Amino acid sequence: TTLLNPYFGEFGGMYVPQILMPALNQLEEAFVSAQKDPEFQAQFADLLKNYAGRPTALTKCQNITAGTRTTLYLKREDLLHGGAHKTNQVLGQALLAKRMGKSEIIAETGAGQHGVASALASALLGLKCRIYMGAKDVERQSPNVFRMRLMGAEVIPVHSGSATLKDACNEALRDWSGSYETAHYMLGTAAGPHPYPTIVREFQRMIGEETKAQILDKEGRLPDAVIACVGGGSNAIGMFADFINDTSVGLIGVEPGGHGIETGEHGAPLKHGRVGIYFGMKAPMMQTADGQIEESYSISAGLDFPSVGPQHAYLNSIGRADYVSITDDEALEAFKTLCRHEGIIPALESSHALAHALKMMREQPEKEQLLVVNLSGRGDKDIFTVHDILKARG
Amino acid sequence: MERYENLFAQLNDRREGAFVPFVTLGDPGIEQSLKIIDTLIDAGADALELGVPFSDPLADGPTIQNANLRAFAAGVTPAQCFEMLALIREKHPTIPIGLLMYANLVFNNGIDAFYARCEQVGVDSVLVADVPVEESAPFRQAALRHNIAPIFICPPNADDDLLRQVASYGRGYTYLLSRLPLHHLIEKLKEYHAAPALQGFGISSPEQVSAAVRAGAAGAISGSAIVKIIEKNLASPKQMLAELRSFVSAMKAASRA
Ligand SMILES: O=C(NCCOP(=O)(O)O)c1ccc(OC(F)(F)F)cc1
Ligand SMILES: O=C(NCCOP(=O)(O)O)c1ccc(OC(F)(F)F)cc1
Ligand SMILES: O=C(NCCOP(=O)(O)O)c1ccc(OC(F)(F)F)cc1
Ligand SMILES: *Cc1c(COP(=O)(O)O)cnc(C)c1O
Ligand SMILES: [Cl-]
Ligand SMILES: [Cl-]
Ligand SMILES: [Cl-]
Ligand code: NA
């Protein structure tokens, strides 16, 4: 029994071992209560404003769109404390942890970004934080590991399986199954078992709410489309949620195309994988023909979650949202374009959303269109990756 | 078929508990795995629980995670596991054979087709580790349509609602987790006419088998302890079988009246 629907159409659910169901039920109850509690809302609003720096700007990009009929705004989640949108929801989940009487946080991280977000929220709220991270990722992500340790988090290298993101997810869940009386599992995207896709959306929805108010103020209308990259689905659902009932507003999700869909070296399960059951949910997966879970590939490690949030699979199935892909080279060109023409260094994740907007503009330059790209994070972290690729290609 | 029902009736007539080893199919290779399984049976296993290697075995601890990795290193696939299952059943007509599966492997090519394949090879039960009772309907339905018992975990803190659901939905046996007093859970499951309880998780010694039976369970399942013997003796296949035989013999002896 649950308080809320765990499915979005056919997608979603609570596919966890029996022992974890009480943890999910407790979390769902606490969330439902919190959402009705003005004190919880006020505390969350206070953190978002005074600690994280909300609202974030909505920046018009005249230089990029000159000579076309595209007007392009960027929602500046890159200016949020921590440099990406992840901060919004980790602050909300940390407050849920405290609401449930918990003093400890467990989190997973791939290349370290959610680990850092989890550690910063834990440090502020006085929670003891432990982060599981694949040994392969630890070795390659010294800066993020160091950030987590500076913020007082325990970083636990995971040597099991293939020692990457999905293995870190596995170890975090195993821990939580034993420790959930005292520890909250701070899941890093709008995916996994109910109630996480719901909670993460609601703790990211201020992205779209602010964007709506800002675009009404500046343009006097709603956008023609809002465009967001999709790794697991959190920044995209946060931008999309408040516009779902505005049927004129396009919702465009951009998965990583990697080296190209036809190569199979991509991270686009929603449009190019196959529905499976894993990570506690029924959703499109990267998987072998016989059902072993595989990896996503992208130039951007942040887009490597090998599935996708169930609400995106649902919005796609009903035709409310449209999902596309952008390759490594397309993302790289968008990264360079924003740096040179607007003086903003975008995350390579966010560069995928920008790249799709640039195509929308360039393919039909006389089409009048008002577009918002969710600029989910800043790209200082990516300058070594970008340097290395540009130098190798001469 | 009626393999669990016949087994428990026979054990009851002998005032005896069941001893049920778990191994991963194809660990450390197909050939050796088939020999391991014959050894477990020859040493006195009353039933088997058999895992199909899966990329992401969330519900498994380190010993079995390592078993999965060994099976993958040997190139073991679900298709090969089903070939193994048919061969095992052909050799051993009455021993109940249960699988421990992950949902994706059941769902992958269709839930109904999965259970039909289990029926074709002569499997008796399937426990899907990451399907809680709440999500179990299509799995239980497909299982029973194909003469397969769906097995559920009963956690030791299970509330009354969960006990009633497990009692109604499960067949073959109830998997009673080691980690309320177990004897009380065992009594409630009996009151609710549940499938006979097998205690599992952390069963590594003869005294734990006897304790399970004394508490009123129908028997005990042991995995990590069996698999550790495989891991310890990888370099010596013959010694591996000798030690498996000794261990299973001791564990089975602990179940006898
Ligand atoms: O995508 C996920 N995490 C994102 C981590 O973010 P980053 O540090 O940037 O890789 C993620 C983690 C867990 C999950 O479900 C479950 F818990 F069941 F495994 C689903 C998605
Ligand atoms: O302790 C556990 N396993 C011991 C029995 O399995 P195995 O060690 O493979 O025989 C165990 C740990 C966690 C768990 O739930 C979840 F997967 F969600 F984390 C279920 C079982
Ligand atoms: O039977 C199992 N393992 C062997 C017995 O445990 P151990 O002797 O500790 O290895 C076993 C049963 C169920 C399971 O997943 C879940 F609990 F979620 F259903 C994982 C392992
Ligand atoms: C983590 C991250 C993403 C991808 O995660 P989603 O849950 O799909 O939003 C995208 N952009 C940035 C900057 C990120 O840090
Ligand atoms: Cl309003
Ligand atoms: Cl150059
Ligand atoms: Cl019932
Ligand atoms: Na993805």
Task: Please tell me the distance between residue B179's alpha carbon and the centre of ligand 2 in angstroms.
Answer: 10
B39-75 CB burial, b ≥16 within 10 A, e <16: bbbebbbbbbbbbbbbbbbbbbeebbbbbbbbbbebe
Choose from B25, B56, B114 for mutation: most chain A CBs within 10 A: B56
Distance CA B36, CA B28 (A): 10
Whether residue B60 has its Cβ less than 6 Å from ligand 2: yes
Distance CA A290, CA A161 (A): 18
Q: Which helix (H) or strand (E) holds B139?
A: helix B137-145
Count CB atoms within 10 A of the CB of residue B13: 8
Residue in A85, A114, A184, A266 annotated catalytic: A85
Distance CA B83, CA B90 (A): 11
Whole-angstrom CA distances from A183 to A127, A193, B182 are: 9, 17, 26
Distance CA B18, CA B38 (A): 17
Rg (CA), chain B: 17
Helix, strand, coil percentages, rounded to 5, for chain A: 50, 20, 30
Task: Go through the domains of chain A in sequence order and give each one's CATH number.
Answer: 8-52+86-204 (3.40.50.1100), 53-85+205-390 (3.40.50.1100)
Sheet hosting strand A183-185, strand order edge to edge: A154-158, A128-134, A104-109, A183-185
Contact call for residues A212 and A245 (beta carbons, < 8 A): no
The string of DSSP letters for A20-42 reads GHHHHHHHHHHHHHHHT-HHHHH
- How is residue A193 annotated by DSSP? S
Task: Tell me which residue has tokens 């467990």.
Answer: A106
Q: Under 8 Å CB-to-CB from A360, ≥6 apart: which residues?
A: A70, A225, A227, A369, A371
Q: Distance of alpha carbon B25 from its chain centroid, rounded?
A: 12
A183 φ, ψ to 5°? Answer: -125, 140
Least Cα separation, residue B123 to chain A (angstroms):
20
Distance CA A187, CA A238 (A): 15
Count CB atoms within 10 A of the CB of residue B253: 13
A85 as an active site residue: the answer is: yes
- How is residue A155 annotated by DSSP? E
- Cα–Cα nearest to A72, from A346, A386, A390, A382: A346
B110-134 CB burial, b ≥16 within 10 A, e <16: ebeebbebbbebbbbbbbbbbbbbb
Tally of helices (H runs) and strands (E runs) in chain B: 12, 9
Say which experimental method was used.
X-ray
Contact call for residues A94 and A153 (beta carbons, < 8 A): no
A344 φ, ψ to 5°? Answer: -120, 125
Distance CA B241, CA B247 (A): 10
Q: Under 8 Å CB-to-CB from B143, ≥6 apart: which residues?
A: B115, B118, B125, B126, B149, B150, B171
Distance CA A53, CA A46 (A): 10
Residue A353 gets the label, from left (phi > 0), alpha (psi -120 to 50) or beta, of: alpha
Distance CA A375, CA A174 (A): 34
Is the link from the previous residue into A306 a cis peptide, with omega within 30 of 0?
A: no
Q: Which atom of ligand 2 is nearest to the CA of B224?
A: 10
Q: Where does chain A have alpha helices with state H?
A: 21-35, 38-46, 62-65, 86-99, 113-125, 135-140, 142-150, 165-179, 196-202, 206-219, 234-240, 269-272, 310-317, 328-342, 348-363, 383-392
In angstroms, this model's resolution equals 1.4
Question: Chain B residues with CB inside 8 Å of A174's CB?
Answer: 58, 61
Contact call for residues A279 and B105 (beta carbons, < 8 A): no
- How is residue A164 annotated by DSSP? S
List active site positions of B: 49, 60
Sheet hosting strand A274-278, strand order edge to edge: A7-8, A11-12, A281-285, A274-278
Least Cα separation, residue B23 to chain A (angstroms):
18
**Minimum-distance CB partner of A21 among B55, B69, B134:** B134
Residue B31 gets the label, from left (phi > 0), alpha (psi -120 to 50) or beta, of: alpha
Rg (CA), chain A: 20
Task: Please tell me the distance between residue A364's alpha carbon and the centre of ligand 7 in angstroms.
Answer: 59
- Cβ of residue B162 closer than 8 Å to a chain A Cβ: yes
- Cα–Cα nearest to B61, from A19, A27, A349, A326: A19
Task: Please tell me the distance between residue B104's alpha carbon and the centre of ligand 8 in angstroms.
Answer: 17
B198 φ, ψ to 5°? Answer: -110, 125
Count CB atoms within 10 A of the CB of residue A131: 27
- How is residue A163 annotated by DSSP? S
Q: Give the tokens for residue B153.
A: 């975990």
The string of DSSP letters for B92-138 reads -SSS-EEEEE-HHHHHTT-HHHHHHHHHHHT--EEEETT--GGG-HH
Residue located nearest, by CA, to atom 19 of ligand 3: B129
